[PDB]
Amino acid sequence: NEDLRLHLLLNTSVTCNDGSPAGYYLKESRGSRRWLLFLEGGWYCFNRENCDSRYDTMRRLMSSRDWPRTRTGTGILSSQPEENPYWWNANMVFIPYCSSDVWSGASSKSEKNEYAFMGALIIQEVVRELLGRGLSGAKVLLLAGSSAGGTGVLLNVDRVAEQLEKLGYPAIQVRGLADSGWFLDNKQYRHTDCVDTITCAPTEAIRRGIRYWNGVVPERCRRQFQEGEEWNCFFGYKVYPTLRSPVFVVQWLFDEAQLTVDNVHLPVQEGLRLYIQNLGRELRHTLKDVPASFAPACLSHEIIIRSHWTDVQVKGTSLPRALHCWDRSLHTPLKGCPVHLVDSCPWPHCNPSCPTG
Numbered sequence: 001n002e003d004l005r006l007h008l009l010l011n012t013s014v015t016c017n018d019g020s021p022a023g024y025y026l027k028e029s030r031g032s033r034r035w036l037l038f039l040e041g042g043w044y045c046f047n048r049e050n051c052d053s054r055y056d057t058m059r060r061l062m063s064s065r066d067w068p069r070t071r072t073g074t075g076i077l078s079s080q081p082e083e084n085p086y087w088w089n090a091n092m093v094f095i096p097y098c099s100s101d102v103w104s105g106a107s108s109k110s111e112k113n114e115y116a117f118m119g120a121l122i123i124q125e126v127v128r129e130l131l132g133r134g135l136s137g138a139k140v141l142l143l144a145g146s147s148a149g150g151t152g153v154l155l156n157v158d159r160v161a162e163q164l165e166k167l168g169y170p171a172i173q174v175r176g177l178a179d180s181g182w183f184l185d186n187k188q189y190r191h192t193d194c195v196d197t198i199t200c201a202p203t204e205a206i207r208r209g210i211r212y213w214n215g216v217v218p219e220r221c222r223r224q225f226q227e228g229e230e231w232n233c234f235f236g237y238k239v240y241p242t243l244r245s246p247v248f249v250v251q252w253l254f255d256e257a258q259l260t261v262d263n264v265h266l267p268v269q270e271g272l273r274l275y276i277q278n279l280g281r282e283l284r285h286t287l288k289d290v291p292a293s294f295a296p297a298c299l300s301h302e303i304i305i306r307s308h309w310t311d312v313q314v315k316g317t318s319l320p321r322a323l324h325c326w327d328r329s330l331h332t333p334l335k336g337c338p339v340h341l342v343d344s345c346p347w348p349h350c351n352p353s354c355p356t357g
Protein backbone atom coordinates (compact mmCIF):
# COMPACT_ATOMS: atom_id res chain seq x y z
CA ASN A 1 0.00 0.00 0.00
CA GLU A 2 1.13 3.54 -0.91
CA ASP A 3 -1.50 5.36 1.08
CA LEU A 4 -0.20 8.89 1.83
CA ARG A 5 -0.49 11.30 -1.11
CA LEU A 6 1.97 14.12 -1.80
CA HIS A 7 0.78 17.72 -1.66
CA LEU A 8 3.34 20.39 -2.49
CA LEU A 9 2.75 23.61 -0.58
CA LEU A 10 0.37 26.00 -2.30
CA ASN A 11 2.51 28.85 -0.94
CA THR A 12 5.53 28.06 -3.09
CA SER A 13 7.64 30.64 -1.23
CA VAL A 14 7.91 28.15 1.66
CA THR A 15 10.67 26.01 0.24
CA CYS A 16 13.17 23.23 0.67
CA ASN A 17 16.86 24.12 0.77
CA ASP A 18 17.14 24.56 -2.99
CA GLY A 19 14.02 26.72 -3.43
CA SER A 20 11.77 23.89 -4.59
CA PRO A 21 8.41 23.83 -2.78
CA ALA A 22 8.17 21.96 0.48
CA GLY A 23 5.16 19.73 1.03
CA TYR A 24 3.47 16.98 2.99
CA TYR A 25 2.04 13.50 2.42
CA LEU A 26 -1.56 13.08 3.61
CA LYS A 27 -3.98 10.22 4.17
CA GLU A 28 -7.30 11.44 5.52
CA SER A 29 -9.44 9.42 7.92
CA ARG A 30 -12.87 10.99 7.66
CA GLY A 31 -14.77 10.83 10.92
CA SER A 32 -11.55 10.83 12.94
CA ARG A 33 -10.76 14.06 14.74
CA ARG A 34 -7.18 12.93 15.54
CA TRP A 35 -4.38 14.31 13.37
CA LEU A 36 -0.81 13.01 13.45
CA LEU A 37 1.80 15.30 11.86
CA PHE A 38 5.17 13.55 11.67
CA LEU A 39 8.49 15.38 11.17
CA GLU A 40 11.10 13.32 9.35
CA GLY A 41 14.72 13.41 10.52
CA GLY A 42 18.11 13.18 8.82
CA TRP A 43 20.90 15.18 10.51
CA TYR A 44 21.47 18.79 9.26
CA CYS A 45 24.10 20.89 7.55
CA PHE A 46 25.59 24.05 9.02
CA ASN A 47 27.74 25.71 6.33
CA ARG A 48 27.97 26.05 2.55
CA GLU A 49 30.60 23.33 2.16
CA ASN A 50 28.80 20.57 4.08
CA CYS A 51 25.43 21.62 2.63
CA ASP A 52 26.91 21.42 -0.88
CA SER A 53 28.09 17.86 -0.18
CA ARG A 54 24.68 16.91 1.20
CA TYR A 55 23.10 18.41 -1.91
CA ASP A 56 25.17 16.14 -4.10
CA THR A 57 24.44 12.80 -2.46
CA MET A 58 21.53 13.39 -0.04
CA ARG A 59 19.45 15.60 -2.30
CA ARG A 60 16.01 14.33 -1.23
CA LEU A 61 16.79 15.92 2.16
CA MET A 62 17.30 19.28 0.41
CA SER A 63 14.82 19.33 -2.49
CA SER A 64 11.37 18.11 -3.51
CA ARG A 65 12.26 17.77 -7.21
CA ASP A 66 12.54 13.96 -6.95
CA TRP A 67 9.95 13.17 -4.27
CA PRO A 68 7.53 10.34 -5.13
CA ARG A 69 3.82 11.00 -5.52
CA THR A 70 2.97 8.63 -2.62
CA ARG A 71 4.51 7.07 0.48
CA THR A 72 3.46 4.11 2.64
CA GLY A 73 2.55 4.95 6.22
CA THR A 74 4.55 2.71 8.56
CA GLY A 75 4.71 2.29 12.29
CA ILE A 76 2.78 5.06 14.04
CA LEU A 77 1.81 6.31 10.54
CA SER A 78 0.25 2.94 9.61
CA SER A 79 -3.52 2.71 9.27
CA GLN A 80 -3.56 -1.02 10.10
CA PRO A 81 -4.34 -1.77 13.79
CA GLU A 82 -1.93 -4.73 13.74
CA GLU A 83 0.99 -2.44 12.91
CA ASN A 84 -0.33 0.59 14.84
CA PRO A 85 -2.41 -0.34 17.92
CA TYR A 86 -2.18 3.30 19.05
CA TRP A 87 -3.61 5.62 16.37
CA TRP A 88 -4.39 3.47 13.31
CA ASN A 89 -7.59 5.44 12.57
CA ALA A 90 -6.06 8.92 12.68
CA ASN A 91 -5.53 11.37 9.85
CA MET A 92 -1.90 10.75 8.86
CA VAL A 93 0.60 13.40 7.75
CA PHE A 94 4.26 12.82 6.86
CA ILE A 95 6.23 16.05 6.47
CA PRO A 96 9.53 15.43 4.62
CA TYR A 97 12.65 17.01 6.08
CA CYS A 98 14.12 19.14 3.31
CA SER A 99 15.46 22.14 5.26
CA SER A 100 18.55 20.59 6.97
CA ASP A 101 18.00 22.93 9.97
CA VAL A 102 16.47 20.67 12.66
CA TRP A 103 13.15 22.30 11.72
CA SER A 104 14.32 25.62 13.18
CA GLY A 105 14.90 27.89 10.21
CA ALA A 106 13.06 30.91 8.86
CA SER A 107 15.38 32.11 6.06
CA SER A 108 14.61 32.22 2.33
CA LYS A 109 17.00 31.72 -0.57
CA SER A 110 18.06 35.23 -1.61
CA GLU A 111 20.86 37.16 -3.30
CA LYS A 112 23.12 36.38 -0.31
CA ASN A 113 21.80 32.90 0.62
CA GLU A 114 22.62 29.87 -1.52
CA TYR A 115 20.07 27.81 0.43
CA ALA A 116 16.76 28.43 2.16
CA PHE A 117 16.39 27.19 5.75
CA MET A 118 12.66 27.27 6.37
CA GLY A 119 11.84 24.30 8.61
CA ALA A 120 9.89 26.32 11.20
CA LEU A 121 7.89 27.97 8.41
CA ILE A 122 7.28 24.67 6.63
CA ILE A 123 5.55 23.32 9.75
CA GLN A 124 3.47 26.50 10.08
CA GLU A 125 2.48 26.39 6.41
CA VAL A 126 1.55 22.69 6.48
CA VAL A 127 -0.67 23.38 9.50
CA ARG A 128 -2.30 26.36 7.74
CA GLU A 129 -3.07 24.44 4.55
CA LEU A 130 -4.34 21.41 6.51
CA LEU A 131 -6.92 23.58 8.30
CA GLY A 132 -8.83 23.85 5.02
CA ARG A 133 -8.59 20.06 4.53
CA GLY A 134 -10.24 19.00 7.80
CA LEU A 135 -7.76 19.99 10.51
CA SER A 136 -10.16 22.81 11.51
CA GLY A 137 -12.37 20.12 13.03
CA ALA A 138 -9.64 18.33 14.96
CA LYS A 139 -9.69 17.63 18.67
CA VAL A 140 -6.02 16.49 18.97
CA LEU A 141 -3.06 17.39 16.78
CA LEU A 142 -0.08 15.22 17.75
CA LEU A 143 3.13 16.71 16.35
CA ALA A 144 5.54 13.77 16.24
CA GLY A 145 9.01 13.30 14.78
CA SER A 146 12.10 11.12 14.80
CA SER A 147 15.77 12.10 15.30
CA ALA A 148 16.19 15.67 14.01
CA GLY A 149 12.41 15.60 13.64
CA GLY A 150 12.10 14.68 17.30
CA THR A 151 14.17 17.73 18.22
CA GLY A 152 11.94 19.58 15.74
CA VAL A 153 8.90 18.65 17.86
CA LEU A 154 10.50 20.16 20.95
CA LEU A 155 11.33 23.33 19.01
CA ASN A 156 7.94 23.70 17.33
CA VAL A 157 5.10 22.14 19.38
CA ASP A 158 4.36 25.35 21.33
CA ARG A 159 4.54 27.44 18.16
CA VAL A 160 1.92 25.24 16.52
CA ALA A 161 -0.26 25.61 19.63
CA GLU A 162 0.17 29.39 19.54
CA GLN A 163 -0.50 29.48 15.78
CA LEU A 164 -3.81 27.65 16.13
CA GLU A 165 -4.89 29.85 19.06
CA LYS A 166 -4.12 33.02 17.09
CA LEU A 167 -5.95 31.69 14.03
CA GLY A 168 -9.08 31.08 16.10
CA TYR A 169 -8.95 27.32 16.85
CA PRO A 170 -8.60 27.13 20.66
CA ALA A 171 -10.29 23.70 20.83
CA ILE A 172 -7.51 21.81 19.02
CA GLN A 173 -5.30 20.20 21.68
CA VAL A 174 -1.72 20.33 20.40
CA ARG A 175 0.64 17.68 21.81
CA GLY A 176 4.16 16.53 20.99
CA LEU A 177 5.81 13.12 20.55
CA ALA A 178 9.60 13.49 20.34
CA ASP A 179 11.36 10.27 19.28
CA SER A 180 15.17 9.99 19.40
CA GLY A 181 15.59 13.77 19.56
CA TRP A 182 16.62 14.12 23.24
CA PHE A 183 20.38 14.67 23.12
CA LEU A 184 23.05 15.47 25.68
CA ASP A 185 25.64 18.23 25.23
CA ASN A 186 28.24 15.96 26.81
CA LYS A 187 31.97 15.44 26.38
CA GLN A 188 33.06 13.21 23.53
CA TYR A 189 34.69 9.90 24.38
CA ARG A 190 37.55 10.90 22.04
CA HIS A 191 37.80 14.47 20.81
CA THR A 192 37.29 15.30 17.13
CA ASP A 193 37.67 18.53 15.20
CA CYS A 194 34.36 20.01 14.04
CA VAL A 195 35.16 19.61 10.36
CA ASP A 196 32.29 17.36 9.20
CA THR A 197 28.71 16.77 10.39
CA ILE A 198 28.44 13.34 12.00
CA THR A 199 31.57 13.54 14.17
CA CYS A 200 31.20 17.16 15.29
CA ALA A 201 30.35 17.46 18.97
CA PRO A 202 26.67 18.35 19.57
CA THR A 203 27.21 21.78 21.17
CA GLU A 204 28.94 23.57 18.28
CA ALA A 205 27.24 22.62 15.02
CA ILE A 206 23.98 24.03 16.37
CA ARG A 207 25.64 27.37 17.21
CA ARG A 208 26.84 27.76 13.62
CA GLY A 209 23.54 26.42 12.29
CA ILE A 210 21.40 29.01 14.09
CA ARG A 211 23.36 31.82 12.42
CA TYR A 212 23.44 30.04 9.05
CA TRP A 213 19.77 29.04 9.22
CA ASN A 214 18.36 32.10 10.99
CA GLY A 215 17.17 29.46 13.45
CA VAL A 216 14.40 30.11 15.98
CA VAL A 217 13.74 28.49 19.34
CA PRO A 218 10.73 28.50 21.72
CA GLU A 219 10.16 31.87 23.34
CA ARG A 220 10.39 30.90 27.01
CA CYS A 221 13.60 28.97 26.44
CA ARG A 222 15.02 31.87 24.40
CA ARG A 223 14.25 34.27 27.27
CA GLN A 224 16.17 32.04 29.70
CA PHE A 225 19.33 31.55 27.65
CA GLN A 226 19.27 34.91 25.77
CA GLU A 227 21.15 36.14 22.71
CA GLY A 228 24.02 34.00 21.46
CA GLU A 229 23.00 31.08 23.70
CA GLU A 230 19.85 29.89 21.91
CA TRP A 231 21.70 26.67 20.97
CA ASN A 232 20.89 25.47 24.50
CA CYS A 233 17.26 25.17 23.44
CA PHE A 234 18.07 22.34 20.98
CA PHE A 235 18.82 20.08 23.97
CA GLY A 236 15.70 18.35 25.27
CA TYR A 237 16.55 18.47 28.96
CA LYS A 238 16.91 22.29 28.78
CA VAL A 239 14.00 23.14 26.46
CA TYR A 240 11.45 20.61 27.79
CA PRO A 241 10.79 22.37 31.15
CA THR A 242 9.91 25.58 29.27
CA LEU A 243 7.23 23.93 27.10
CA ARG A 244 3.50 24.25 27.75
CA SER A 245 2.10 21.59 25.42
CA PRO A 246 2.09 17.98 26.67
CA VAL A 247 5.15 16.19 25.23
CA PHE A 248 5.85 12.44 25.34
CA VAL A 249 9.59 11.67 25.04
CA VAL A 250 10.83 8.44 23.40
CA GLN A 251 14.58 7.99 23.68
CA TRP A 252 16.93 5.01 23.59
CA LEU A 253 19.32 5.30 26.53
CA PHE A 254 22.23 4.51 24.20
CA ASP A 255 21.13 6.32 21.06
CA GLU A 256 23.38 5.56 18.08
CA ALA A 257 23.42 9.19 16.88
CA GLN A 258 24.34 10.38 20.39
CA LEU A 259 27.20 7.88 20.35
CA THR A 260 28.25 9.02 16.87
CA VAL A 261 28.52 12.68 17.87
CA ASP A 262 30.39 11.43 20.98
CA ASN A 263 32.89 9.64 18.67
CA VAL A 264 32.01 6.18 20.04
CA HIS A 265 32.36 3.31 17.56
CA LEU A 266 31.57 -0.26 18.62
CA PRO A 267 36.00 -6.20 23.50
CA VAL A 268 35.07 -3.02 25.37
CA GLN A 269 37.68 -1.92 27.89
CA GLU A 270 37.20 -0.07 31.18
CA GLY A 271 37.24 3.52 29.92
CA LEU A 272 34.65 2.96 27.21
CA ARG A 273 32.50 0.79 29.48
CA LEU A 274 32.46 3.56 32.08
CA TYR A 275 31.70 6.13 29.38
CA ILE A 276 28.72 4.16 28.05
CA GLN A 277 27.37 3.40 31.54
CA ASN A 278 27.66 7.07 32.52
CA LEU A 279 25.84 8.08 29.33
CA GLY A 280 22.90 5.83 30.12
CA ARG A 281 22.77 7.07 33.71
CA GLU A 282 22.85 10.71 32.57
CA LEU A 283 20.08 10.12 30.04
CA ARG A 284 18.01 8.38 32.73
CA HIS A 285 18.62 11.31 35.09
CA THR A 286 17.35 13.85 32.54
CA LEU A 287 14.10 11.87 32.18
CA LYS A 288 13.39 11.42 35.91
CA ASP A 289 10.93 14.37 35.92
CA VAL A 290 9.47 13.75 32.46
CA PRO A 291 6.13 12.11 33.34
CA ALA A 292 5.35 10.77 29.83
CA SER A 293 8.44 8.98 28.55
CA PHE A 294 9.60 5.66 27.10
CA ALA A 295 13.34 5.09 27.37
CA PRO A 296 14.62 1.55 26.76
CA ALA A 297 18.19 0.47 27.51
CA CYS A 298 19.12 -0.27 23.88
CA LEU A 299 21.78 0.72 21.37
CA SER A 300 19.55 1.73 18.43
CA HIS A 301 18.25 4.73 16.46
CA GLU A 302 14.62 5.97 16.00
CA ILE A 303 11.55 3.79 16.62
CA ILE A 304 8.19 5.27 15.90
CA ILE A 305 7.85 4.86 12.10
CA ARG A 306 9.48 1.40 12.00
CA SER A 307 6.99 -1.36 11.19
CA HIS A 308 8.06 -3.42 14.24
CA TRP A 309 7.85 -0.47 16.66
CA THR A 310 5.29 -2.55 18.58
CA ASP A 311 7.90 -5.03 19.80
CA VAL A 312 9.92 -3.12 22.41
CA GLN A 313 8.64 -3.08 25.98
CA VAL A 314 9.82 -1.38 29.15
CA LYS A 315 8.66 -3.00 32.39
CA GLY A 316 6.25 -5.10 30.31
CA THR A 317 4.57 -2.15 28.53
CA SER A 318 4.93 -1.44 24.81
CA LEU A 319 5.24 2.06 23.33
CA PRO A 320 1.81 1.92 21.62
CA ARG A 321 0.31 0.97 24.99
CA ALA A 322 2.21 3.74 26.82
CA LEU A 323 0.99 6.25 24.22
CA HIS A 324 -2.59 5.00 24.66
CA CYS A 325 -2.18 5.40 28.43
CA TRP A 326 -0.94 8.94 27.79
CA ASP A 327 -4.09 9.67 25.77
CA ARG A 328 -6.17 8.42 28.70
CA SER A 329 -4.18 10.53 31.16
CA LEU A 330 -5.07 13.67 29.15
CA HIS A 331 -8.84 13.03 29.14
CA THR A 332 -3.41 10.88 39.00
CA PRO A 333 -1.95 7.62 37.66
CA LEU A 334 -3.97 4.90 35.96
CA LYS A 335 -4.20 1.29 37.13
CA GLY A 336 -2.21 -0.93 34.80
CA CYS A 337 -1.71 1.88 32.28
CA PRO A 338 1.69 3.50 32.94
CA VAL A 339 3.13 6.46 31.07
CA HIS A 340 6.61 6.91 32.67
CA LEU A 341 8.71 3.96 31.46
CA VAL A 342 12.48 4.39 31.81
CA ASP A 343 14.77 1.37 31.99
CA SER A 344 17.15 1.24 34.94
CA CYS A 345 19.52 -1.46 33.77
CA PRO A 346 22.91 -0.03 32.81
CA TRP A 347 24.12 -1.63 29.51
CA PRO A 348 22.82 -1.82 25.89
CA HIS A 349 20.45 -4.78 25.43
CA CYS A 350 19.98 -5.43 29.14
CA ASN A 351 16.35 -5.07 28.08
CA PRO A 352 15.60 -8.36 26.26
CA SER A 353 13.08 -6.65 23.93
CA CYS A 354 15.66 -4.34 22.33
CA PRO A 355 15.65 -4.35 18.51
CA THR A 356 17.81 -7.22 17.34
CA GLY A 357 19.43 -5.40 14.41
Ligand SMILES: *[C@@H]1O[C@H](CO)[C@@H](O)[C@H](O)[C@H]1NC(C)=O
Nearest residue numbers: 011012013014121122124125
Ligand atom coordinates in the same frame (compact mmCIF):
# COMPACT_ATOMS: atom_id res chain seq x y z
C1 LIG B 1 4.00 32.32 2.28
O1 LIG B 1 4.93 31.91 3.27
C2 LIG B 1 5.87 32.92 3.66
C3 LIG B 1 6.80 32.28 4.66
O2 LIG B 1 6.19 32.18 5.94
C4 LIG B 1 5.14 34.13 4.22
O3 LIG B 1 6.08 35.17 4.45
C5 LIG B 1 4.06 34.62 3.26
O4 LIG B 1 3.27 35.61 3.90
C6 LIG B 1 3.16 33.47 2.82
N1 LIG B 1 2.20 33.92 1.84
C7 LIG B 1 0.97 33.40 1.72
C8 LIG B 1 0.11 33.97 0.64
O5 LIG B 1 0.58 32.49 2.46
Ligand SMILES: CC(=O)N1CCc2c(Cl)cccc21
Nearest residue numbers: 043102147148151183202257
Ligand atom coordinates in the same frame (compact mmCIF):
# COMPACT_ATOMS: atom_id res chain seq x y z
C1 LIG C 1 21.26 12.78 14.16
C2 LIG C 1 20.71 14.11 14.63
O1 LIG C 1 19.79 14.64 14.09
N1 LIG C 1 21.33 14.77 15.74
C3 LIG C 1 22.44 14.27 16.53
C4 LIG C 1 22.78 15.37 17.50
C5 LIG C 1 21.62 16.35 17.37
C6 LIG C 1 21.31 17.46 18.12
CL1 LIG C 1 22.43 17.81 19.43
C7 LIG C 1 20.19 18.24 17.85
C8 LIG C 1 19.36 17.87 16.79
C9 LIG C 1 19.66 16.75 16.02
C10 LIG C 1 20.85 16.02 16.34
